[PDB]
Design a binder for this molecule. Sequence first.
Ligand SMILES: *[C@@H]1O[C@H](CO)[C@H](O)[C@H](O[C@@H]2O[C@H](CO)[C@H](O)[C@H](O)[C@H]2O)[C@H]1NC(C)=O
Length: 13
Amino acid sequence: ECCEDGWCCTAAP
Ligand SMILES: *[C@@H]1O[C@H](CO)[C@H](O)[C@H](O[C@@H]2O[C@H](CO)[C@H](O)[C@H](O)[C@H]2O)[C@H]1NC(C)=O
C-alpha cells in the first residue's frame, strides 16, 4: 500500500 500505490514515497524524515 502507498509506496507500491506509487503516490507515497519521498524523503519526509
Ligand atoms: C520527497 O522529499 C523531498 C524533500 O526533501 C522532495 O523534494 C519532495 O519534498 C516534499 O514534497 C513536497 C515538496 O514540494 C511537500 O511540500 C513536502 O513538504 C516536501 O518535504 C518529496 N517528493 C515528492 C514526490 O513529493
